[PDB]
Symmetry: C3
């Protein structure tokens, strides 16, 4: 029985940016058409140049953020070009049935498949590859995961009948990586994903990542690729982790409204310091910037953040508010008449 | 001052099934009588046949689910037969005082004890052995844990004054295990729990399980022992973890109503993808099945799920709903006129 | 533009105790003045006498609890005496801007600095040192963390318009420690924090603590330093963890009202068995004691609690309530006419 709705093709963009979309809409349901192309490739994952045999949707870690509204249909063309070596598929945590779509999307190199799922559940959700058995964790921790956001047609709200609107949106995908080391402790390089598998599985079994990165590599979202904002902007930060828990924190800020389980049928929590993304989920936080300067966005296992790669920066333009915070006295020698014991 | 209420003896059943009970009741408070018999025994824990020196309530990992109503008294006879080697006791997280009952239930082999506790707190709760000191974690991670559910007398509700009723209930106990390996990496076998202790404690101290299993072994709830359901059934899934965090996910489904901290005085969250069972707790999720087929129920550390044992299956009978999900085009060769870069 | 409010100097006290304060107040906003003095020193961290090169605020792990009200200004003098070897600073998760104050408070040995921040967000919050880069996790896991509580001016409430008042307050700071071992497995000793750094960073990178302690050492809050209470008292337990998740549980009790994300703009959850402190946060639980005796307060990874140091005790005076719990029959030989199979 053919589905007779308007069709809209969406052009995906690389994270941490997001394709153009409406928050609130008075459009009715549409068939929203997306294409994802699997790419297996070697990628650089840290500031010392360590390489890694990655597997990706659309060439990025994370895969791109897809944005639709409640009641839309999502028609995904998944493509596995013949230059790839492995079968792949896709599981949407937003979707109902057939292992999230994985049981309908297994494609060999040289094949494509078209899946349609109805967006009946609001929130941010993980999507990931899941070919079967031990291949499931391996494909996910090799980079084959992203997220989808299903907005209410009226946009976000505070759970108390007040509209919330973001000025800007970023998608932070966090990736735990398991890179083998040689006897001297140096990271090993491989010529293919298959050649890396046996040694990688041994690291995976001990459940301790070697790297924890945002946007696919240590330092990806620092320096020139810091995330921009302005004082007064309400920024939505979508965070996903397909395999392992995370505890996001905006250093110098807060989560004004946080959906840490990521589902917009639930009222957000207010005024959080640190929130929790359970492995296998996406969450989202709104924050209105009140001060200019550098902010560090981390997982608040600080060892992970500083030493394994999991720090992003915001660079925020505007005027400093000395009422909220001020340096009353700059660093100075301790007065000779001081005690301090 | 004798307690003059009606008495009701309950026959426990092995997980993942649950003894017969009423959801809503107009019976008044009763003294609900349960018996738990400690059994120390070697058990098989994985598909390669690895054995393990287990310690159990009633011969199973997890121990059986006990179900009562708010205001009931729970009178537990704990039995430690003389074939066992160790003292044991029981701590109910549902109970008030004396370390949950552990300080009133320490029994040597050849002894039994009778504890009564009032079910003043609604929810699902862990129970576990806790003899003292380093024996506490060792007995728990050797299998001595289960759960109890204290229903409201009116049954479950959505926290917004609507009744919720399940058609079916399953109890998923998740167990982290710490099995020693020899120099070549093979799992070691022992002739008694005491002989296994020193080597096991060394693995425990590094806080990384060798196995993470549902119902006591890898594959316990797959194949012929898959969990049955039907399209349209509302299924309650109780999940416990006495020692370590878990992140349950129903692959191809959702949590319609989830009490992730497990306590029915709190409204459930709606429409979750993945929830979080904090170590030392039980939680519960309702889901109404909408699609037939195989579902995988996992902890969404996919390494744990696929490679350390933590996958169950549901086999769901009914009619496929192509409105919720459909394969628009089956796998096919990528069209020669395609780009895809 | 000078801030013309009354000033009040607060004398901090060592955890787990808390400086005197009012819960509800009709005082207007004040400038609340605190002093923190960094102390680097060797400390004993376990019952076998293992030493550790610690770095502290005010000589304690955790640093002391600071208590203010919503709308107060907090003026902190941070002092780094010239006997210390390292630069230090302070980041308040309660504060807005400049990395929580860290970007305005970096002081060398022999210097002090004065920071003022407005307490615009209610809750319990972590504070910690964060000098920059890999020094951030190292200073935090060396002991440089504490907490601040920002009460509503009307005191706590249940989120349903009922006042909650505590009779007693304790602050439990949990610390994950990473102590190097020699080839034979013995803990290594060092003559300075700098000498310990390289070996410590190697342990930190594997993300598995050697010790998990409350109030700075295994057994700190047991024996003669058990926490006192009485039957009928409502006790607030503030719990912080600056780097790593925790799952608090009061053995033999409950959390009557729990703010596990720690922020008093959110209604507490009721009747919890175990709650969850995400690393990089503080939470709080109220409990009204109903039974006398010993209670153990743990993180409910029982391996951490029993074997790595993370157990406190409450000693509760009062009368036992046999309605809530009773030993119906003391331990006795299993009757000869018993079955039990
Ligand atoms: Cu794949
Ligand atoms: Cu998944
Ligand atoms: Cu036992
Ligand atoms: Cu317990
Ligand atoms: Cu410091
Ligand atoms: Cu911090």
């Amino acid at each position: 029985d053919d589905l007779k709705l308007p069709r809209q093709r969406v052009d995906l963009v690389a994270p941490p940016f997001v394709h153009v979309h409406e928050q609130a809409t008075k459009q009715g349901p549409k068939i929203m058409e997306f294409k994802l192309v699997v790419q297996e490739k070697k990628m650089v994952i840290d500031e010392k140049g360590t390489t890694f045999q990655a597997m990706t949707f659309n060439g990025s870690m994370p895969g791109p953020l897809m944005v639709v509204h409640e009641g839309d249909y999502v028609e995904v063309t998944l493509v596995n070009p013949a230059t790839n070596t492995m079968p792949h598929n896709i599981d949407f945590h937003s979707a109902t049935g057939a292992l999230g779509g994985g049981a309908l999307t297994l494609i060999n190199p040289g094949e494509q498949v078209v899946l349609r799922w109805k967006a009946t559940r609001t929130g941010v959700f993980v999507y990931h590859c899941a070919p079967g058995g031990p291949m499931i964790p391996w494909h996910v921790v090799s980079g084959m995961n992203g997220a989808v956001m299903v907005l209410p047609r009226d946009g976000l709200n505070d759970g108390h009948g007040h509209s919330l609107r973001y000025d800007r949106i970023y998608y932070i995908g966090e990736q735990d990586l398991y890179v083998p080391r040689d006897e001297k402790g140096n990271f090993k390089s491989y010529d293919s994903p298959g050649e890396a598998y046996s040694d990688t599985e041994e690291v995976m079994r001990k459940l301790t990542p070697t790297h924890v990165v945002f946007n696919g590599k240590a330092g990806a979202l620092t320096g020139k690729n810091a995330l921009n904002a302005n004082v007064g902007e309400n920024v939505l930060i979508v965070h996903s982790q397909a395999n392992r828990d995370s505890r996001p924190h905006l250093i110098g800020g807060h989560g004004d409204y946080v959906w840490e389980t990521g589902k917009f049928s639930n009222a957000p929590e207010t005024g959080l310091e640190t929130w929790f993304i359970r492995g296998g989920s996406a969450g989202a936080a709104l924050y209105k910037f009140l001060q200019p300067g550098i902010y560090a966005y981390v997982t608040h296992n600080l060892i992970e953040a500083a030493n394994l790669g999991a720090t992003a920066h915001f660079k925020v333009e505007g005027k400093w508010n000395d009422d909220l915070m001020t340096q009353v006295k700059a660093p100075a020698d301790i007065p000779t008449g001081s005690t301090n014991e």
